[PDB]
Design a protein around this ligand. Sequence first.
Ligand code: NAG
Ligand code: CA
Ligand code: CA
Ligand code: CA
Ligand code: CL
Ligand code: NA
Ligand code: NA
Ligand code: NA
Ligand code: NA
Length: 472
Amino acid sequence: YQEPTDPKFPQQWYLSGVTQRDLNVKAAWAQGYTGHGIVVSILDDGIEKNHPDLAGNYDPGASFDVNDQDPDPQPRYTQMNDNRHGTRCAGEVAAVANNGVCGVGVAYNARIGGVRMLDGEVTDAVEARSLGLNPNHIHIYSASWGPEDDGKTVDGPARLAEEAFFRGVSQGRGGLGSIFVWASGNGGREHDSCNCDGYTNSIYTLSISSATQFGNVPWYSEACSSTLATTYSSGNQNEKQIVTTDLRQKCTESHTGTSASAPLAAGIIALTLEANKNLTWRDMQHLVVQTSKPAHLNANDWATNGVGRKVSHSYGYGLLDAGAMVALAQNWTTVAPQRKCIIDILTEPKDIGKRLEVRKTVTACLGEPNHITRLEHAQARLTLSYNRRGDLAIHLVSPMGTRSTLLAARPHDYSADGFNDWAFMTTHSWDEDPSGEWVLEIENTSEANNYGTLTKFTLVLYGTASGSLVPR
Ligand SMILES: *[C@@H]1O[C@H](CO)[C@@H](O)[C@H](O)[C@H]1NC(C)=O
Ligand SMILES: [Ca+2]
Ligand SMILES: [Ca+2]
Ligand SMILES: [Ca+2]
Ligand SMILES: [Cl-]
Ligand code: NA
Ligand code: NA
Ligand code: NA
Ligand code: NA
């Protein structure tokens, strides 16, 4: 195997590293996996389809302009180069290799397109038409953005967009399911908590956070239990950043944020799908859980879950490992059909006051076709009133003792609107047996005399009842 000769490939430290602080992509390339036959679409502000490092892989069938309602996602050029982000993300996935231009994509033989959707008013309809673009041609969708990362917003897909997620994972990709890769957010400096973003908090999105070059949690990172894994991105000014294609046929060394992590993950997922085109959308999440690596990622919240895997709210299961992903994909056995066990927990509304604990012992649909002994995602769907939402912190503890933070205190969130059946999701109990006692904790983290009521708590378990591995 000959590594790429591109002039900035040596600067792509998160791929070309020899120091074990990389995504282990060369190992996948050397196994023969470069993305051939896979199609990825960037949902963003457009794609410079004539960029010298993108044209050779550009796919019009992976592209659309839902802002102007035409097929051509070319960005709108402005003095400030506002609409450059999709082009940066596209190059991360699939910049051409060995062509003397810039660097290379993770999946440098994949086909790449873009949906121009962010350069205009983003409505539910715009979102749905983007998520649902050509779902039997595009394999993987990469989205780096969501509701405002101001640390006070709670929002997610409205009805059309939610329908697009369920149509995508159910009928997309020949019934195997569209793979939606999502950035978990850039709201760290606002103390944002990413389960309040219903796109990344979705079970249908494979959610990705960031680590700095030196292995730290970047200033912009949001912690939450819905995140699955991590890719490298930017950090402080002594740490390197992402090197990729830029607007106006240029090359940037200063692509940043969690919004630069999701495209790298999408590229690794493209390599993985080349290794096994029969992987379902759930299979892909299983592979990520099993192969991601905590080593050398620094966080104070690494915890071992009930099946022996280390998990963090900053990093999920750790750094994506492309070589391990493609290796495990090859002989992967398709997971069983997804079961869903719905448990209405409360017998009466509960005053929250300063602190509320709700304990319930469940059988996880014992005796029914939705019996789950092997959890995937778990949700606590909560309806509650409270006078100042961001003073709340919420935790969910599984029968195996795994404490998922569903919501951290958000100091900017002054809302009096509470949560209306908000489906806080955790990945941290993946593969655990969910039978037994679950504990929900809601706490007022402020000294204020805050008040409200929990009126509904639905525990929703997803998973199967077969195929478990020995704990790690
Ligand atoms: C894909 O997986 C399904 C489910 O296990 C199986 O029935 C089918 O034969 C597989 N197809 C290929 C081409 O491997
Ligand atoms: Ca256009
Ligand atoms: Ca190149
Ligand atoms: Ca956020
Ligand atoms: Cl469902
Ligand atoms: Na975001
Ligand atoms: Na997700
Ligand atoms: Na534990
Ligand atoms: Na149990």
